[PDB]
């Protein structure tokens, strides 16, 4: 499906991204695709990825996509779907991401990337456990 294509593009193995253009395209799928399914697909791609030194990028980018959606979808239905999906699969964050090891990266900076992944995982858990924090960060974001 197009939303899956968009998410795949935004979470590719290139050494930069996802770009604002990538993210805006993902977001636009909400017009016809439930946010639950968009989130679920992103989580599926994440778990699947848990050139060897580039694979971790998919992991970090999936988390960035989840963060972006949390910050950018509308209150009500869209936000609630993302949150339900994440809560249902919460172990992905509390165990798989919290314990994720970047064994090898092409840039030799494995530790920075591993910290980045785990911090993004922590941040998502904070948003989920503290809706007032998410609200504040959604406001800062505009």
UniProtKB/Swiss-Prot annotation:
Subcellular location: Cytoplasm; Endosome membrane
Entire protein: shown range: 31 to 188 of 411
GO cellular component terms, A-Z: clathrin vesicle coat; cytoplasm; cytosol; endosome; endosome membrane; plasma membrane
Record domain ENTH: where: 1-138
Protein name as it appears in the record: Epsin-5
Species the sequence originates in: Saccharomyces cerevisiae (strain ATCC 204508 / S288c)
Subunit-level organization: Interacts with the clathrin adapter GGA2 and the clathrin adapter complex AP-1.
Role description: Involved in the recruitment of clathrin to the Golgi network and endosomes to form clathrin coated vesicles. Plays a role in the trafficking of clathrin between the Golgi network and endosomes. Binds to membranes enriched in phosphatidylinositol-3,5-bisphosphate (PtdIns(3,5)P2) and, in association with VPS27, is involved in protein sorting at the multivesicular body (MVB).
Presence of keyword Acetylation: yes
GO BP, sorted A to Z: actin filament organization; early endosome to Golgi transport; endocytosis; Golgi to endosome transport; late endosome to vacuole transport via multivesicular body sorting pathway; protein transport
Disulphide bonds in the chain: none
Superkingdom, natural source: Eukaryota
Keyword field: Acetylation, Cytoplasm, Endosome, Lipid-binding, Membrane, Phosphoprotein, Protein transport, Transport
GO molecular function terms listed in the Swiss-Prot or TrEMBL record: clathrin binding; phosphatidylinositol-3,5-bisphosphate binding; phospholipid binding
Comment field (misc): Present with 8100 molecules/cell in log phase SD medium.
């Amino acid at each position: 499906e197009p939303y899956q294509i968009d998410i795949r593009r935004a979470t590719n193995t290139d050494a930069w991204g996802p770009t604002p253009k990538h993210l805006a395209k993902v977001l636009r799928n909400r017009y016809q695709v439930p946010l639950y399914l968009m989130t679920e697909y992103t989580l599926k791609r994440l778990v699947d990825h848990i050139n060897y030194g580039s694979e971790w990028r998919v992991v970090l980018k999936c988390l960035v996509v989840i963060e972006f959606l949390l910050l950018n979808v509308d209150t009500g239905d869209e936000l609630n779907q993302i949150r339900s999906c994440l809560l249902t699969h919460k172990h992905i964050l509390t165990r798989e991401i919290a314990q994720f090891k970047v064994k090898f990266s092409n840039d030799g900076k494995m530790e920075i990337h591993e910290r980045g992944i785990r911090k993004k995982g922590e941040l998502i858990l904070q948003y989920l456990e503290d809706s007032q924090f998410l609200k504040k960060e959604r406001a800062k974001n505009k």
